[PDB]
Structure 1
């Protein structure tokens, strides 16, 4: 039986990122355009969109 490995997401406040291919099995990676995480006791970004 397998084991899915899921790391902490990377959030970039007022920025953008790029997907990078890797050598892992069944590896997936995506970047989503406009977020507003609201981490806890705050929004975690000073950046609306």
Structure 2
């Protein structure tokens, strides 16, 4: 199972941020404009417009799948292995072959 890491947006308002591309799995970086964050308690910066949000998100393996993974082997050749019991005279023995 995957896990979507979502770093906190870098809202460089009163300016202009740029899409800093990366190489993480399925990495997505988007840059918006004309956005007015509204952090609790009032506006987020003295500007009224001309602001940018550098939203980014990328996939990553779940924090725990050393325990919950599903292998995808590719099997080609078999190999028999049998446990046999033999009873002649009196040996009453069992062997692995």
Q: Deviations over 1:1-49 (max 9, x none)?
A: 10000010011121001111212000000110111111010101110xx
Please identify runs of 4+ aligned residues in structure 1 that moved more than 6 A. none
TM-score normalized by structure 2?
0.46
Structure showing the higher strand proportion among its residues:
2
- C-alpha separation between the residues in 2 aligned to 1:23 and 1:13? 26
TM-score (structure 1 length as normaliser): 0.86
Aligned to 2:9: 9
CA distance in 2, matches of 1:12, 1:22: 19
Larger radius of gyration: 2
Matched residue pairs, number?
47
Please give the root-mean-square deviation of Cα atoms over the aligned residues, in Å: 0.8
